[PDB]
Amino acid sequence: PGIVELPSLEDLKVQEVKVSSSVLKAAAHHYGAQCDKPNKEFMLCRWEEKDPRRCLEEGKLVNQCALEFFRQIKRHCAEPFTEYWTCIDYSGLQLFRRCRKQQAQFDECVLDKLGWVRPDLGDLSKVTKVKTDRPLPENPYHSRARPEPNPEVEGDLKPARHGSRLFFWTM
Amino acid sequence: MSMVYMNIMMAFTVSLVGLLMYRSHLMSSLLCLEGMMLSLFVMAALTILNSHFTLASMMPIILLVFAACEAALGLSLLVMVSNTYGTDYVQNLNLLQC
Amino acid sequence: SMMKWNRERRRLQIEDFEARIALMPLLQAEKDRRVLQMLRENLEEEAT
Amino acid sequence: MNLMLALLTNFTLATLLVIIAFWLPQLNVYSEKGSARLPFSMKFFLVAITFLLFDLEIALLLPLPWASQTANLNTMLTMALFLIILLAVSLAYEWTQKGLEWTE
Amino acid sequence: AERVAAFLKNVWAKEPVLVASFAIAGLAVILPTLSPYTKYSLMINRATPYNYPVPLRDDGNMPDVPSHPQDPQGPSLEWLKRL
Amino acid sequence: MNPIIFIIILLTIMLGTIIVMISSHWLLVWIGFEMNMLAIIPIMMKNHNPRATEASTKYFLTQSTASMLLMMAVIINLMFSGQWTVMKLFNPMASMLMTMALAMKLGMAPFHFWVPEVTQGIPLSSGLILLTWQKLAPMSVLYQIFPSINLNLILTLSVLSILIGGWGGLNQTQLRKIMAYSSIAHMGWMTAVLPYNPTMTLLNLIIYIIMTSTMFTMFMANSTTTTLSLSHTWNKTPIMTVLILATLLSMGGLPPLSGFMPKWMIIQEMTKNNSIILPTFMAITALLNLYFYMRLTYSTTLTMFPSTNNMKMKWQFPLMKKMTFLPTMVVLSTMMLPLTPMLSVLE
Amino acid sequence: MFMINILMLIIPILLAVAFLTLVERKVLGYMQLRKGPNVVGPYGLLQPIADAIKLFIKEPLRPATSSASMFILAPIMALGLALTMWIPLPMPYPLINMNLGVLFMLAMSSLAVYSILWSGWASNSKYALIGALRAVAQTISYEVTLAIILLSVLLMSGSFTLSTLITTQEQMWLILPAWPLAMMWFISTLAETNRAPFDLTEGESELYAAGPFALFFMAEYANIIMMNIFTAILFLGTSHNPHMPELYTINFTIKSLLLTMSFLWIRASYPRFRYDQLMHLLWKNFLPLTLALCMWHVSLPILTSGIPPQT
Amino acid sequence: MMLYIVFILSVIFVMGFVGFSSKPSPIYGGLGLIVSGGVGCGIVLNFGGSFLGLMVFLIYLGGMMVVFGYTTAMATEQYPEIWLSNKAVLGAFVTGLLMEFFMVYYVLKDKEVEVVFEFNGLGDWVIYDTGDSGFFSEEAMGIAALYSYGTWLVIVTGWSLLIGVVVIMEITRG
């Protein structure tokens, strides 16, 4: 068999979004709306290619968008956001419904300072369409050529010649 | 294969030999029959869970349910044998010798 | 009373599930690189 | 690891209480002061066997809270009621056949 | 109508526990078919997104597929917010 | 047994068999066997006596052991192919285990010891089911998994069954034990041809069932379970003695009777495969069966054994047992050879 | 730090059992126009201590048992399993947070019948063995309704997690939509724990000693308390404020205390069932209703559009 | 190491089987099966099967094995015979433990063994899946599918249980 081709350790380097899960949860709804386009392009690539090696560049853009998104929050709404994700982080289940006062302050800050409108219930679970320059993979499974089917019997069905032909039987 | 499979198959073999090598009590042989079921349940569950065969996750339950019903029938035969002879000894079940 | 609360709980679950969907692309990108980095690292020690 | 520790603690303590309950100072210096049909009704066998069969049915009903999350609710509700009705038919059969009686 | 009514009164007097059991079991079988809310249980179960909604490659002739989650195309959960 | 319950139990015996025959999933095949074994036990027990209880217990132990081995084969097959489809198995150890399990279910030698004993200990109607309907499900699985059976194993089982069935029947005076050893011998022909042409397996199974049902039905008609009791038939129902004679000769494979057809066809298929020693050995060994069939004809039809005085009281009453389908089955059991080419419907 | 937590569950459980013996005696006394213990310590507060010490320094008269291993096994199983039943209980936070906590409690409780069976075998007396089998038959019979009733309730909760019952009852106690099940659940726990009017092990033998007797008693009374804590969670859900978890613990304790006192109240109020009669209460009354209410509680969330979330 | 927990549990699994398979008094044989059942549940638990693990406890141990012990106390053994008192039981018990110990020792020394068939001994963790981040239990999804996908399974299973009730009432009426 061949050699499993892997990218270099340096080909995998990229700035990482080193914030905790409660921080991501607090920003998740605005993040979904703001960074949708690079995110959907990456997920389209992953499901079409079925190979993480083929979508690394798309994955680097996912990180870049996330960083710029969190740099905008830091520049403008650092204090309402900090109060909000700190309220999420207290909960053992990270419940949204226990932090509606703080969510409203953060939501009101991004709308005024950035024009960010929180997506409605149901929106982020929509199936959306992506315009990609990437070619569509042709054999993503690396399938071999399928075996040729058995030759196909055809014609007109005629009575058996001289019957069953079983030993002495004449029919 | 994986190391766990060595012992699960060994458990089934041990209970099968126990089942085929009777002593006196019919109940002791019925326990070996349940032992084979338990090893089958574990072997099936391990295979199904590790392979992430999602719809097959119900199969061990069906195995358990049907084999417990089988065991209930087996126990009922044991008590009827015990009512006849006063024990569950297999040596008493030799009338059909002739 | 149980119907009203359960409907609200279903709406709260959808909101929680949609937050996860918003983050899955970022997590998937991170997971791919971690897996590939780990495999690459094992390949260096294998060479040695 | 926590569950293992809790279980180990619970039964280890139970073991310690049992052994000390058996071996305590006594302050005495003198000498201290089979497999047949037990005479037990067939009715008690039938209770245990009846419990087993109902317990196996219960095992099949246990997934119901998860099954109610399916989009195939029509099928799911029909099959849930079918199983419970069959359980009721089982009880009706034992009842009308005097399987639940304790006389005689 | 009356002989059945005279039958029910007898079982209600003699076996109220069994009459209640059969009454409840009948309602459990019948009411789902009559209820106007039963249809919503199907919709709510389908509206719960357990796995990622994989986007479609845009071929230029999908006017009913939103390009952005906040676009107006695609299923709406406005009916659920009111419910 | 309440007649409605009897019907429902009988319908469940059939349903278990049908589930095995229509299933494409090994789990559902296993369920069919479990359901079938659950419903058969009550009809073995229905006459409440120690012999029936011993027979049901021996049956339960044999069948439950075989079903565990079948489940083991299914699970090994799952690990080595990741699927449950009923077809060839993908592991030789799974194939052996399933073949041995089906052999135990069929009562093939050397797993045969339970057949004569269980058949003896249950009523005639229950023995009829055991030796006919109960062969359908295990045979229908062999029909499907045969591409992966070990040839040496299956042919060894076939040869041993024909030998044990033939020899075992020579020493029997009980009618239920004779039919049991006859069944063991006939299962040997069914499986011997399976590797070469499964259609002949079906043909031998169908003709075997017809002839076996005819014998049991004629035994039930007169309530006879021993050779000597059967020898009184000539003085009560002379027509029955003639029907028994024809059926026994047919079961002996004598031309021009129906029972010759399966042996004829099986020999043909085996020779086409250059199997010459095995068919010849099989045909000669089957003469042992013919011998203890002939012995029964002697004491039933071709001579008149001594009677009793109370037999005269029986002259004044008519046969009241149902004898369902007996006229049809006896004709098929004996007069079908001219229609042999009809076997192609089984393809 | 986790071992500290285990001890801070085990020790209070055993102390609460000890003083339930005092409370039961005093509550029964005042319902009988008398006082109950009031000499051994002020208001009888030292009575449990005197009883505990007395029992353990008592001669451990065990007749030559037919099985030494099963004589020791039964009390260890009984007490070990009784304490295990407490580790998933959210009060409001469980010691062990199990996704299938409700199912874990059902499975562990079903094992407690082995201590009855093993103690019967070890007694080396067919009379005590027959008494054990009658108790086992009563216990498994009422396990049928407890499981089905529990399943019916969870169809409104949505999961097997015990803490999800807290969320389900944020607006309203489950006893309101499900008081018919709460009624049969409550009586089933009485019969499950062999409590009067279902205390037929005590009554029938009328018609173990020292420490080993004490251990079976401790396990019994631990189970009684745990059953009533379970009932409070199942049907009388306390609201949880994540920033003041002790308000949950105070309110939930009061409900469990009151439910436990109602066990003593009932014991003071009624005669005992005959054995066949408590068997008919189950198979011919509770089970038909439980099955019908199980059918109803499968249909109800579907027909009202009130299916709870999975998570 | 805790990296071999599944293997260790399976070692105890086998020892419990050699326990009751040597067939001591049915009371002690029942105990060996109960221990094996609990150990078997732990093996299933460590592969991610929480529900399947708890079914063994709930149904197999709390259900079937209770009825086995109940029936044993009634119609088989009321007082156990001294364990390993019979020579045949002791020989069988010792033989199974000797075989088991050799498998364990050899597979641990070479991290692999060929007992009839060849097994790996690196630890069972090596075959585990490396990418799970779904918001549900997959085992729970599969079992819940009995009511949507498995209509046929429910029908035949429910029918067999009802027939089991009818059948056992026929068998025992005598």
Ligand SMILES: CCCCCCCCCCCCO[C@@H]1O[C@H](CO)[C@@H](O[C@H]2O[C@H](CO)[C@@H](O)[C@H](O)[C@H]2O)[C@H](O)[C@H]1O
């Ligand atoms: C509305 C439908 C709801 C779905 C219900 C779910 C299925 C439940 C099936 C239970 C069937 C029980 O069927 C039951 O059979 C017996 C027949 O002996 C009848 O009871 C009959 O026998 C008893 C003795 O046992 C007599 O005292 C009584 O006078 C007579 O009625 C019951 O009246 C009937 O209810």
Ligand SMILES: CCCCCCCCCCCCO[C@@H]1O[C@H](CO)[C@@H](O[C@H]2O[C@H](CO)[C@@H](O)[C@H](O)[C@H]2O)[C@H](O)[C@H]1O
């Ligand atoms: C002994 C055998 C016992 C068998 C018992 C079987 C009883 C089955 C009774 C309930 C079956 C129908 O139950 C209920 O009926 C309504 C019909 O209005 C169905 O239809 C309803 O839900 C569907 C969702 O699928 C909606 O699209 C539809 O608009 C709505 O009317 C429900 O999907 C079904 O849940």
Ligand SMILES: CCCCCCCCCCCCO[C@@H]1O[C@H](CO)[C@@H](O[C@H]2O[C@H](CO)[C@@H](O)[C@H](O)[C@H]2O)[C@H](O)[C@H]1O
């Ligand atoms: C009657 C006792 C029943 C006890 C059953 C005990 C469980 C049995 C375990 C069977 C699983 C192992 O089954 C066995 O696996 C190995 C590889 O893994 C297969 O493969 C083996 O033989 C074939 C030969 O061509 C080759 O693949 C290779 O030489 C060898 O590895 C065997 O063909 C198969 O028979």
Ligand SMILES: CCCCCCCCCCCCO[C@@H]1O[C@H](CO)[C@@H](O[C@H]2O[C@H](CO)[C@@H](O)[C@H](O)[C@H]2O)[C@H](O)[C@H]1O
């Ligand atoms: C819970 C912790 C409590 C810690 C207390 C520690 C105190 C240790 C001193 C124990 C004193 C026990 O005192 C002793 O108990 C045993 C109980 O079997 C009694 O019984 C013993 O002596 C009598 C004869 O005197 C014997 O017939 C009897 O078989 C023997 O058991 C003694 O009559 C009593 O004197």
Ligand SMILES: N=C(N)NC(=N)NCCc1ccc(I)c(Cl)c1
């Ligand atoms: N498996 C075998 N050895 N024999 C077999 N079935 N061969 C297939 C050949 C065949 C023969 C008769 C007919 I009619 C049809 Cl349609 C086809």
Ligand SMILES: N=C(N)NC(=N)NCCc1ccc(I)c(Cl)c1
């Ligand atoms: N039933 C009652 N309440 N009275 C009663 N007889 N109690 C028993 C006394 C007892 C038993 C064990 C322990 I530990 C403790 Cl401390 C006290």
